[PDB]
Amino acid sequence: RNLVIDITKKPTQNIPPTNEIIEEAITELNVDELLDRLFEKDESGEVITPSRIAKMLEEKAFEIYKEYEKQVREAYLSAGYSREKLEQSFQQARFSRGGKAFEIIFTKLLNKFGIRYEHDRVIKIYDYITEGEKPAFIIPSVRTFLNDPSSAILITVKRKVRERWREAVGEAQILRNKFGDEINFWFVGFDEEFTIYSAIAMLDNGIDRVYVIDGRYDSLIEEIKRISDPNFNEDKYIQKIRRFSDIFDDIIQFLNKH
Amino acid sequence: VRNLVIDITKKPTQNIPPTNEIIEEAITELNVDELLDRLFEKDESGEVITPSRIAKMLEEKAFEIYKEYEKQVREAYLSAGYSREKLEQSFQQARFSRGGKAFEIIFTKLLNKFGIRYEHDRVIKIYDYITEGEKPAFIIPSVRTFLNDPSSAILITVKRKVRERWREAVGEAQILRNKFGDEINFWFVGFDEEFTIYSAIAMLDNGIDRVYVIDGRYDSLIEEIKRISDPNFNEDKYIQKIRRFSDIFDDIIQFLNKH
DNA sequence: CATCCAGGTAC
Protein backbone atom coordinates (compact mmCIF):
# COMPACT_ATOMS: atom_id res chain seq x y z
CA ARG A 1 0.00 0.00 0.00
CA ASN A 2 1.21 3.46 1.07
CA LEU A 3 4.21 4.88 -0.76
CA VAL A 4 6.48 7.53 0.59
CA ILE A 5 6.33 10.16 -2.17
CA ASP A 6 9.20 12.52 -2.89
CA ILE A 7 7.98 15.20 -5.36
CA THR A 8 11.53 16.31 -6.17
CA LYS A 9 11.73 12.98 -8.01
CA LYS A 10 10.27 12.27 -11.39
CA PRO A 11 6.82 10.93 -10.52
CA THR A 12 7.40 7.39 -11.70
CA GLN A 13 10.60 7.13 -9.65
CA ASN A 14 8.25 6.91 -6.63
CA ILE A 15 6.82 3.69 -8.03
CA PRO A 16 8.55 0.55 -6.75
CA PRO A 17 10.61 -1.29 -9.30
CA THR A 18 8.96 -3.90 -11.44
CA ASN A 19 10.91 -6.73 -9.84
CA GLU A 20 9.50 -5.76 -6.44
CA ILE A 21 5.98 -5.58 -7.84
CA ILE A 22 6.38 -8.97 -9.49
CA GLU A 23 7.56 -10.41 -6.15
CA GLU A 24 4.51 -8.82 -4.49
CA ALA A 25 2.30 -10.37 -7.19
CA ILE A 26 3.97 -13.74 -6.78
CA THR A 27 3.35 -13.64 -3.02
CA GLU A 28 -0.26 -12.40 -3.39
CA LEU A 29 -1.17 -15.04 -6.00
CA ASN A 30 0.67 -17.86 -4.21
CA VAL A 31 2.54 -18.42 -7.45
CA ASP A 32 5.36 -20.47 -5.94
CA GLU A 33 2.93 -23.13 -4.78
CA LEU A 34 1.21 -22.78 -8.16
CA LEU A 35 4.57 -23.36 -9.92
CA ASP A 36 5.01 -26.54 -7.85
CA ARG A 37 1.93 -27.82 -9.77
CA LEU A 38 2.88 -26.79 -13.29
CA PHE A 39 0.91 -28.71 -15.95
CA GLU A 40 -1.57 -30.03 -13.40
CA LYS A 41 -5.14 -28.75 -13.12
CA ASP A 42 -5.85 -25.80 -10.85
CA GLU A 43 -8.95 -25.64 -8.68
CA SER A 44 -10.93 -23.99 -11.48
CA GLY A 45 -10.19 -26.99 -13.73
CA GLU A 46 -7.68 -25.23 -15.97
CA VAL A 47 -4.24 -26.64 -16.60
CA ILE A 48 -1.58 -24.60 -14.81
CA THR A 49 0.61 -23.58 -17.69
CA PRO A 50 3.55 -21.21 -17.80
CA SER A 51 1.52 -18.99 -20.21
CA ARG A 52 -1.43 -18.80 -17.82
CA ILE A 53 0.85 -18.14 -14.86
CA ALA A 54 2.61 -15.43 -16.86
CA LYS A 55 -0.66 -13.85 -17.88
CA MET A 56 -2.00 -13.96 -14.31
CA LEU A 57 1.21 -12.49 -12.96
CA GLU A 58 1.30 -9.80 -15.61
CA GLU A 59 -2.29 -8.85 -14.72
CA LYS A 60 -1.72 -8.87 -10.97
CA ALA A 61 1.51 -6.92 -11.31
CA PHE A 62 -0.38 -4.40 -13.41
CA GLU A 63 -3.08 -4.08 -10.76
CA ILE A 64 -0.43 -3.45 -8.11
CA TYR A 65 1.36 -1.05 -10.41
CA LYS A 66 -1.92 0.81 -11.03
CA GLU A 67 -2.46 1.26 -7.28
CA TYR A 68 1.01 2.78 -6.97
CA GLU A 69 0.38 4.84 -10.10
CA LYS A 70 -2.83 6.16 -8.52
CA GLN A 71 -0.98 7.10 -5.36
CA VAL A 72 1.67 8.92 -7.32
CA ARG A 73 -0.92 10.60 -9.55
CA GLU A 74 -2.85 11.88 -6.61
CA ALA A 75 0.24 13.16 -4.84
CA TYR A 76 1.64 14.87 -7.88
CA LEU A 77 -1.65 16.45 -8.84
CA SER A 78 -1.97 17.69 -5.25
CA ALA A 79 1.47 19.24 -5.82
CA GLY A 80 0.30 20.95 -9.02
CA TYR A 81 2.26 18.77 -11.44
CA SER A 82 1.20 18.95 -15.08
CA ARG A 83 -1.50 16.35 -15.65
CA GLU A 84 -0.54 15.90 -19.27
CA LYS A 85 3.14 15.28 -18.46
CA LEU A 86 2.21 13.04 -15.58
CA GLU A 87 -0.01 10.88 -17.80
CA GLN A 88 2.69 10.81 -20.48
CA SER A 89 5.20 9.71 -17.89
CA PHE A 90 2.85 7.04 -16.72
CA GLN A 91 2.20 5.71 -20.22
CA GLN A 92 5.93 5.58 -20.84
CA ALA A 93 6.37 3.83 -17.54
CA ARG A 94 3.66 1.36 -18.50
CA PHE A 95 5.40 0.54 -21.76
CA SER A 96 8.79 0.03 -20.10
CA ARG A 97 7.40 -1.83 -17.10
CA GLY A 98 4.96 -3.89 -19.13
CA GLY A 99 7.93 -5.21 -21.05
CA LYS A 100 10.07 -5.59 -17.95
CA ALA A 101 7.28 -7.40 -16.09
CA PHE A 102 7.03 -9.96 -18.82
CA GLU A 103 10.80 -10.39 -18.91
CA ILE A 104 10.98 -10.81 -15.17
CA ILE A 105 8.11 -13.30 -15.19
CA PHE A 106 10.06 -15.16 -17.87
CA THR A 107 13.08 -15.31 -15.59
CA LYS A 108 10.94 -16.53 -12.68
CA LEU A 109 9.85 -19.38 -14.96
CA LEU A 110 13.44 -20.07 -16.09
CA ASN A 111 14.42 -20.20 -12.43
CA LYS A 112 11.59 -22.62 -11.59
CA PHE A 113 12.63 -24.95 -14.39
CA GLY A 114 16.24 -24.76 -13.11
CA ILE A 115 17.43 -23.35 -16.40
CA ARG A 116 20.79 -21.62 -16.33
CA TYR A 117 20.77 -18.36 -18.20
CA GLU A 118 22.31 -15.00 -18.47
CA HIS A 119 20.09 -11.97 -18.92
CA ASP A 120 20.61 -8.71 -20.78
CA ARG A 121 24.30 -9.37 -21.35
CA VAL A 122 25.80 -7.65 -24.38
CA ILE A 123 27.29 -9.78 -27.13
CA LYS A 124 30.00 -7.62 -28.70
CA ILE A 125 29.90 -7.42 -32.46
CA TYR A 126 32.90 -5.09 -32.80
CA ASP A 127 35.52 -5.34 -30.10
CA TYR A 128 36.14 -1.57 -30.40
CA ILE A 129 32.46 -0.60 -29.94
CA THR A 130 31.02 -0.95 -26.45
CA GLU A 131 27.51 -1.36 -27.81
CA GLY A 132 26.44 -4.76 -29.17
CA GLU A 133 23.50 -7.11 -29.35
CA LYS A 134 21.61 -7.87 -26.16
CA PRO A 135 19.29 -10.86 -26.45
CA ALA A 136 16.87 -10.95 -23.51
CA PHE A 137 18.35 -14.31 -22.57
CA ILE A 138 21.39 -16.34 -23.42
CA ILE A 139 21.10 -19.95 -22.37
CA PRO A 140 23.10 -21.27 -20.58
CA SER A 141 25.67 -18.47 -20.80
CA VAL A 142 27.48 -16.09 -23.08
CA ARG A 143 30.62 -18.28 -22.64
CA THR A 144 28.85 -21.28 -24.04
CA PHE A 145 27.46 -19.18 -26.87
CA LEU A 146 30.85 -17.80 -27.86
CA ASN A 147 32.51 -21.20 -27.73
CA ASP A 148 29.87 -23.02 -29.63
CA PRO A 149 26.87 -20.94 -30.74
CA SER A 150 25.13 -24.19 -31.81
CA SER A 151 25.07 -25.20 -28.12
CA ALA A 152 23.39 -22.04 -26.77
CA ILE A 153 20.00 -20.43 -27.15
CA LEU A 154 19.45 -16.71 -27.67
CA ILE A 155 15.91 -15.68 -26.75
CA THR A 156 14.30 -12.36 -27.42
CA VAL A 157 11.02 -11.69 -25.64
CA LYS A 158 8.30 -9.12 -26.33
CA ARG A 159 4.88 -8.57 -24.88
CA LYS A 160 2.76 -6.93 -27.56
CA VAL A 161 4.67 -7.21 -30.78
CA ARG A 162 3.18 -4.85 -33.39
CA GLU A 163 5.79 -4.44 -36.15
CA ARG A 164 8.62 -4.79 -33.66
CA TRP A 165 9.19 -8.44 -34.52
CA ARG A 166 11.41 -7.11 -37.31
CA GLU A 167 13.80 -6.03 -34.53
CA ALA A 168 14.32 -9.68 -33.78
CA VAL A 169 15.04 -10.37 -37.45
CA GLY A 170 17.57 -7.53 -37.38
CA GLU A 171 19.21 -8.78 -34.18
CA ALA A 172 19.37 -12.29 -35.57
CA GLN A 173 20.93 -11.03 -38.79
CA ILE A 174 23.58 -9.04 -36.98
CA LEU A 175 24.42 -12.06 -34.81
CA ARG A 176 24.32 -14.55 -37.73
CA ASN A 177 26.51 -12.24 -39.75
CA LYS A 178 29.08 -12.33 -36.97
CA PHE A 179 28.74 -15.77 -35.49
CA GLY A 180 27.41 -17.77 -38.38
CA ASP A 181 24.19 -19.45 -39.23
CA GLU A 182 24.55 -22.09 -36.48
CA ILE A 183 23.22 -19.82 -33.76
CA ASN A 184 19.87 -20.62 -32.22
CA PHE A 185 17.64 -17.60 -31.94
CA TRP A 186 14.14 -18.01 -30.52
CA PHE A 187 11.48 -15.34 -30.47
CA VAL A 188 8.86 -15.09 -27.78
CA GLY A 189 5.85 -12.82 -28.16
CA PHE A 190 2.97 -12.49 -25.75
CA ASP A 191 0.44 -11.11 -28.08
CA GLU A 192 -2.94 -12.47 -29.06
CA GLU A 193 -2.76 -10.51 -32.34
CA PHE A 194 0.55 -11.98 -33.40
CA THR A 195 0.41 -12.38 -37.16
CA ILE A 196 1.07 -15.26 -39.51
CA TYR A 197 3.25 -13.17 -41.75
CA SER A 198 5.49 -12.19 -38.86
CA ALA A 199 5.89 -15.83 -37.86
CA ILE A 200 6.70 -17.06 -41.36
CA ALA A 201 8.93 -14.10 -42.16
CA MET A 202 10.90 -14.60 -38.97
CA LEU A 203 11.24 -18.34 -39.50
CA ASP A 204 12.51 -17.73 -43.02
CA ASN A 205 14.92 -15.00 -41.91
CA GLY A 206 17.07 -16.12 -39.04
CA ILE A 207 14.70 -16.98 -36.23
CA ASP A 208 14.69 -20.68 -35.40
CA ARG A 209 11.54 -20.82 -33.35
CA VAL A 210 8.61 -18.57 -32.66
CA TYR A 211 6.73 -18.82 -29.40
CA VAL A 212 3.28 -17.37 -29.11
CA ILE A 213 0.96 -16.72 -26.21
CA ASP A 214 -0.87 -19.96 -25.80
CA GLY A 215 -4.26 -18.52 -26.69
CA ARG A 216 -3.06 -17.54 -30.15
CA TYR A 217 -1.42 -20.84 -31.02
CA ASP A 218 -4.42 -22.79 -32.32
CA SER A 219 -5.79 -20.01 -34.51
CA LEU A 220 -2.32 -19.22 -35.87
CA ILE A 221 -1.69 -22.84 -36.80
CA GLU A 222 -5.13 -23.00 -38.42
CA GLU A 223 -4.19 -20.00 -40.56
CA ILE A 224 -0.98 -21.69 -41.58
CA LYS A 225 -2.86 -24.88 -42.47
CA ARG A 226 -5.11 -22.88 -44.84
CA ILE A 227 -2.10 -22.04 -47.02
CA SER A 228 -1.28 -24.39 -49.94
CA ASP A 229 1.76 -23.80 -52.13
CA PRO A 230 4.65 -26.00 -53.27
CA ASN A 231 7.06 -23.37 -51.87
CA PHE A 232 5.22 -23.28 -48.55
CA ASN A 233 6.79 -25.84 -46.28
CA GLU A 234 3.81 -25.96 -43.92
CA ASP A 235 5.37 -28.53 -41.57
CA LYS A 236 8.43 -26.37 -41.08
CA TYR A 237 6.34 -23.52 -39.71
CA ILE A 238 4.03 -25.71 -37.75
CA GLN A 239 7.04 -27.37 -36.04
CA LYS A 240 8.88 -24.12 -35.38
CA ILE A 241 5.86 -22.23 -34.00
CA ARG A 242 5.31 -23.21 -30.40
CA ARG A 243 3.14 -22.30 -27.43
CA PHE A 244 4.78 -20.03 -24.92
CA SER A 245 4.18 -22.72 -22.33
CA ASP A 246 6.40 -25.15 -24.19
CA ILE A 247 9.52 -23.01 -24.20
CA PHE A 248 10.84 -24.10 -20.81
CA ASP A 249 10.81 -27.78 -21.49
CA ASP A 250 12.00 -26.98 -25.03
CA ILE A 251 15.03 -25.25 -23.54
CA ILE A 252 15.71 -28.21 -21.26
CA GLN A 253 15.33 -30.60 -24.25
CA PHE A 254 17.71 -28.44 -26.26
CA LEU A 255 20.34 -28.32 -23.53
CA ASN A 256 20.08 -32.09 -23.06
CA LYS A 257 20.73 -32.49 -26.82
CA HIS A 258 23.49 -29.85 -26.98
CA VAL B 1 -5.34 27.77 -35.80
CA ARG B 2 -9.09 27.52 -36.48
CA ASN B 3 -11.64 26.96 -33.74
CA LEU B 4 -12.61 23.32 -34.12
CA VAL B 5 -16.14 22.06 -33.94
CA ILE B 6 -15.63 19.26 -31.53
CA ASP B 7 -18.02 16.35 -31.47
CA ILE B 8 -17.49 14.71 -28.10
CA THR B 9 -19.36 11.57 -29.22
CA LYS B 10 -16.31 10.71 -31.38
CA LYS B 11 -12.94 9.42 -30.22
CA PRO B 12 -11.17 12.58 -29.09
CA THR B 13 -8.45 12.45 -31.70
CA GLN B 14 -11.02 12.10 -34.48
CA ASN B 15 -11.73 15.77 -33.81
CA ILE B 16 -8.16 16.73 -34.61
CA PRO B 17 -7.58 17.57 -38.26
CA PRO B 18 -5.48 14.98 -40.07
CA THR B 19 -1.74 15.39 -40.30
CA ASN B 20 -1.84 16.15 -44.04
CA GLU B 21 -4.13 19.11 -43.35
CA ILE B 22 -1.98 20.32 -40.49
CA ILE B 23 1.15 20.02 -42.63
CA GLU B 24 -0.57 22.07 -45.36
CA GLU B 25 -1.55 24.65 -42.74
CA ALA B 26 2.06 24.76 -41.55
CA ILE B 27 3.34 25.03 -45.14
CA THR B 28 1.10 28.06 -45.65
CA GLU B 29 2.01 29.64 -42.33
CA LEU B 30 5.77 29.22 -42.87
CA ASN B 31 5.59 29.99 -46.59
CA VAL B 32 7.48 26.76 -47.13
CA ASP B 33 6.85 26.96 -50.87
CA GLU B 34 8.98 30.10 -50.91
CA LEU B 35 11.65 28.40 -48.75
CA LEU B 36 11.72 25.45 -51.16
CA ASP B 37 12.19 27.94 -54.03
CA ARG B 38 15.33 29.06 -52.19
CA LEU B 39 16.69 25.55 -51.46
CA PHE B 40 20.50 25.48 -50.92
CA GLU B 41 20.65 29.26 -50.99
CA LYS B 42 21.30 31.46 -47.94
CA ASP B 43 18.29 32.86 -46.05
CA GLU B 44 18.08 36.41 -44.60
CA SER B 45 19.59 35.24 -41.25
CA GLY B 46 22.63 33.84 -43.13
CA GLU B 47 21.98 30.08 -42.79
CA VAL B 48 21.71 27.94 -45.92
CA ILE B 49 18.19 26.71 -46.59
CA THR B 50 18.60 22.97 -46.49
CA PRO B 51 16.09 20.15 -46.75
CA SER B 52 16.85 19.16 -43.15
CA ARG B 53 16.20 22.70 -41.90
CA ILE B 54 12.96 23.00 -43.84
CA ALA B 55 11.93 19.57 -42.64
CA LYS B 56 12.71 20.39 -39.03
CA MET B 57 11.01 23.80 -39.21
CA LEU B 58 7.94 22.35 -40.91
CA GLU B 59 7.82 19.46 -38.50
CA GLU B 60 8.00 21.82 -35.51
CA LYS B 61 5.30 24.16 -36.87
CA ALA B 62 2.96 21.27 -37.70
CA PHE B 63 3.53 19.97 -34.15
CA GLU B 64 2.68 23.36 -32.71
CA ILE B 65 -0.54 23.47 -34.74
CA TYR B 66 -1.35 19.93 -33.72
CA LYS B 67 -0.88 20.88 -30.06
CA GLU B 68 -3.22 23.83 -30.40
CA TYR B 69 -5.85 21.51 -31.80
CA GLU B 70 -5.07 18.91 -29.14
CA LYS B 71 -5.63 21.60 -26.48
CA GLN B 72 -8.99 22.50 -27.96
CA VAL B 73 -10.01 18.87 -28.00
CA ARG B 74 -8.67 18.34 -24.49
CA GLU B 75 -10.69 21.22 -23.13
CA ALA B 76 -13.87 19.95 -24.80
CA TYR B 77 -13.44 16.41 -23.48
CA LEU B 78 -12.55 17.58 -19.97
CA SER B 79 -15.72 19.71 -19.98
CA ALA B 80 -17.58 16.51 -20.92
CA GLY B 81 -16.05 14.58 -17.98
CA TYR B 82 -14.08 12.23 -20.22
CA SER B 83 -11.46 9.93 -18.62
CA ARG B 84 -8.31 12.03 -18.40
CA GLU B 85 -6.04 9.01 -18.39
CA LYS B 86 -7.72 7.67 -21.52
CA LEU B 87 -7.73 11.07 -23.17
CA GLU B 88 -4.04 11.63 -22.56
CA GLN B 89 -3.19 8.09 -23.63
CA SER B 90 -5.14 8.67 -26.84
CA PHE B 91 -3.30 11.89 -27.46
CA GLN B 92 0.12 10.27 -26.83
CA GLN B 93 -0.81 7.50 -29.26
CA ALA B 94 -1.93 10.15 -31.77
CA ARG B 95 1.36 11.97 -31.29
CA PHE B 96 3.40 8.83 -32.00
CA SER B 97 1.44 7.97 -35.13
CA ARG B 98 1.15 11.59 -36.32
CA GLY B 99 4.71 12.52 -35.59
CA GLY B 100 5.79 9.63 -37.84
CA LYS B 101 3.27 10.49 -40.50
CA ALA B 102 4.22 14.17 -40.39
CA PHE B 103 7.85 13.35 -41.13
CA GLU B 104 6.87 11.08 -44.01
CA ILE B 105 4.64 13.78 -45.46
CA ILE B 106 7.36 16.38 -45.15
CA PHE B 107 9.72 13.98 -46.90
CA THR B 108 7.25 13.70 -49.82
CA LYS B 109 7.04 17.47 -50.11
CA LEU B 110 10.81 17.51 -50.57
CA LEU B 111 10.66 14.63 -53.04
CA ASN B 112 8.06 16.54 -55.08
CA LYS B 113 10.16 19.67 -55.13
CA PHE B 114 13.07 17.74 -56.62
CA GLY B 115 10.77 15.95 -59.10
CA ILE B 116 11.66 12.62 -57.55
CA ARG B 117 9.01 10.12 -58.39
CA TYR B 118 8.10 7.85 -55.58
CA GLU B 119 5.48 5.58 -54.23
CA HIS B 120 4.46 5.33 -50.62
CA ASP B 121 2.23 2.72 -49.03
CA ARG B 122 3.35 0.02 -51.43
CA VAL B 123 3.72 -3.51 -50.15
CA ILE B 124 6.50 -5.57 -51.64
CA LYS B 125 5.02 -9.06 -51.58
CA ILE B 126 7.37 -11.69 -50.28
CA TYR B 127 5.28 -14.82 -50.62
CA ASP B 128 2.97 -15.82 -53.46
CA TYR B 129 0.60 -17.22 -50.86
CA ILE B 130 0.41 -14.31 -48.35
CA THR B 131 -0.61 -10.77 -49.46
CA GLU B 132 1.34 -9.15 -46.63
CA GLY B 133 4.89 -8.05 -47.27
CA GLU B 134 7.53 -5.48 -46.71
CA LYS B 135 6.66 -1.80 -46.76
CA PRO B 136 9.48 0.66 -47.21
CA ALA B 137 8.27 4.20 -46.56
CA PHE B 138 9.27 5.07 -50.09
CA ILE B 139 10.10 3.20 -53.19
CA ILE B 140 11.87 5.28 -55.77
CA PRO B 141 10.53 5.62 -58.39
CA SER B 142 7.86 2.96 -58.05
CA VAL B 143 7.20 -0.56 -56.92
CA ARG B 144 6.80 -1.65 -60.57
CA THR B 145 10.29 -0.41 -61.30
CA PHE B 146 11.66 -2.15 -58.24
CA LEU B 147 10.04 -5.46 -59.16
CA ASN B 148 11.18 -5.05 -62.78
CA ASP B 149 14.77 -4.52 -61.63
CA PRO B 150 15.48 -4.26 -57.90
CA SER B 151 18.91 -2.76 -58.60
CA SER B 152 17.25 0.17 -60.40
CA ALA B 153 15.07 1.38 -57.50
CA ILE B 154 15.71 2.74 -54.04
CA LEU B 155 13.91 1.48 -50.98
CA ILE B 156 13.88 4.09 -48.26
CA THR B 157 12.86 3.45 -44.69
CA VAL B 158 12.16 6.60 -42.75
CA LYS B 159 11.93 7.07 -38.96
CA ARG B 160 11.64 10.14 -36.77
CA LYS B 161 13.16 9.17 -33.44
CA VAL B 162 14.81 5.79 -33.84
CA ARG B 163 15.53 4.26 -30.43
CA GLU B 164 16.15 0.53 -30.97
CA ARG B 165 13.74 0.47 -33.94
CA TRP B 166 16.56 0.72 -36.46
CA ARG B 167 16.78 -3.06 -36.15
CA GLU B 168 13.38 -3.12 -37.90
CA ALA B 169 15.14 -1.72 -40.94
CA VAL B 170 17.85 -4.40 -40.71
CA GLY B 171 15.00 -6.92 -40.47
CA GLU B 172 13.18 -5.47 -43.44
CA ALA B 173 16.40 -5.36 -45.46
CA GLN B 174 17.12 -9.00 -44.64
CA ILE B 175 13.66 -10.11 -45.71
CA LEU B 176 14.02 -8.15 -48.98
CA ARG B 177 17.59 -9.30 -49.62
CA ASN B 178 16.56 -12.86 -49.01
CA LYS B 179 13.85 -12.53 -51.63
CA PHE B 180 15.44 -10.17 -54.16
CA GLY B 181 19.18 -10.58 -53.61
CA ASP B 182 21.90 -8.32 -52.48
CA GLU B 183 21.59 -5.87 -55.40
CA ILE B 184 18.70 -4.00 -53.81
CA ASN B 185 19.33 -0.43 -52.67
CA PHE B 186 18.05 0.02 -49.16
CA TRP B 187 18.56 3.36 -47.46
CA PHE B 188 17.70 4.31 -43.91
CA VAL B 189 16.69 7.77 -42.85
CA GLY B 190 16.43 8.75 -39.20
CA PHE B 191 15.48 12.17 -37.99
CA ASP B 192 17.00 11.74 -34.57
CA GLU B 193 19.63 13.85 -32.95
CA GLU B 194 20.49 10.87 -30.70
CA PHE B 195 21.12 8.47 -33.57
CA THR B 196 23.93 6.13 -32.42
CA ILE B 197 27.23 5.09 -33.97
CA TYR B 198 26.52 1.43 -33.31
CA SER B 199 23.24 1.61 -35.17
CA ALA B 200 24.95 3.23 -38.18
CA ILE B 201 27.79 0.73 -38.28
CA ALA B 202 25.66 -2.36 -37.61
CA MET B 203 23.14 -1.25 -40.26
CA LEU B 204 25.81 -0.68 -42.87
CA ASP B 205 27.32 -4.10 -42.14
CA ASN B 206 23.92 -5.75 -42.24
CA GLY B 207 22.03 -4.85 -45.37
CA ILE B 208 21.55 -1.12 -45.27
CA ASP B 209 23.42 0.57 -48.08
CA ARG B 210 23.24 4.16 -46.88
CA VAL B 211 22.35 5.75 -43.55
CA TYR B 212 20.94 9.27 -43.45
CA VAL B 213 21.02 11.26 -40.26
CA ILE B 214 19.34 14.53 -39.33
CA ASP B 215 21.87 17.17 -40.36
CA GLY B 216 22.49 18.33 -36.78
CA ARG B 217 23.80 14.90 -35.80
CA TYR B 218 26.03 14.23 -38.79
CA ASP B 219 29.14 16.00 -37.56
CA SER B 220 29.14 14.60 -34.03
CA LEU B 221 28.35 11.12 -35.32
CA ILE B 222 31.25 11.24 -37.74
CA GLU B 223 33.48 12.60 -34.96
CA GLU B 224 32.57 9.61 -32.78
CA ILE B 225 33.46 7.32 -35.66
CA LYS B 226 36.79 9.12 -36.14
CA ARG B 227 37.53 8.73 -32.42
CA ILE B 228 37.48 4.95 -32.66
CA SER B 229 41.26 4.49 -32.47
CA ASP B 230 41.48 0.76 -33.00
CA PRO B 231 43.31 0.61 -36.35
CA ASN B 232 41.35 -2.48 -37.36
CA PHE B 233 38.31 -0.22 -37.70
CA ASN B 234 38.07 1.05 -41.27
CA GLU B 235 36.22 4.34 -40.69
CA ASP B 236 36.26 5.32 -44.38
CA LYS B 237 34.14 2.33 -45.35
CA TYR B 238 31.39 3.61 -43.08
CA ILE B 239 31.80 7.35 -43.29
CA GLN B 240 31.15 7.23 -47.04
CA LYS B 241 27.80 5.52 -46.50
CA ILE B 242 26.62 7.86 -43.71
CA ARG B 243 25.04 11.01 -45.03
CA ARG B 244 23.18 14.07 -43.91
CA PHE B 245 19.44 14.00 -44.43
CA SER B 246 19.80 16.95 -46.73
CA ASP B 247 21.96 14.90 -49.06
CA ILE B 248 19.39 12.26 -49.78
CA PHE B 249 17.60 14.27 -52.47
CA ASP B 250 20.58 14.81 -54.70
CA ASP B 251 21.73 11.25 -53.88
CA ILE B 252 18.43 9.98 -55.25
CA ILE B 253 18.77 12.24 -58.31
CA GLN B 254 22.29 10.91 -58.95
CA PHE B 255 21.21 7.36 -58.40
CA LEU B 256 18.32 7.72 -60.87
CA ASN B 257 20.59 9.49 -63.39
CA LYS B 258 22.93 6.47 -63.23
CA HIS B 259 20.21 3.80 -63.34
C1' DC C 1 -4.63 -4.08 -40.52
C1' DA C 2 0.23 -3.16 -40.17
C1' DT C 3 3.09 0.68 -38.63
C1' DC C 4 3.83 4.85 -36.40
C1' DC C 5 6.81 6.01 -31.99
C1' DA C 6 5.64 14.70 -32.20
C1' DG C 7 9.61 9.17 -26.85
C1' DG C 8 9.90 8.97 -21.54
C1' DT C 9 10.84 5.40 -18.57
C1' DA C 10 13.60 1.86 -16.28
C1' DC C 11 17.48 -1.06 -15.09
Added chain:
DNA sequence: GGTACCTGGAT
Protein backbone atom coordinates in the same frame (compact mmCIF):
# COMPACT_ATOMS: atom_id res chain seq x y z
C1' DG D 1 25.07 6.47 -18.54
C1' DG D 2 23.16 4.47 -22.77
C1' DT D 3 19.86 1.32 -24.82
C1' DA D 4 15.55 -1.34 -25.05
C1' DC D 5 10.91 -1.39 -23.33
C1' DC D 6 6.07 -0.77 -25.92
C1' DT D 7 0.68 -3.66 -19.35
C1' DG D 8 -0.41 -0.16 -27.31
C1' DG D 9 -3.94 3.26 -29.37
C1' DA D 10 -4.00 6.21 -33.32
C1' DT D 11 -3.14 6.31 -37.84
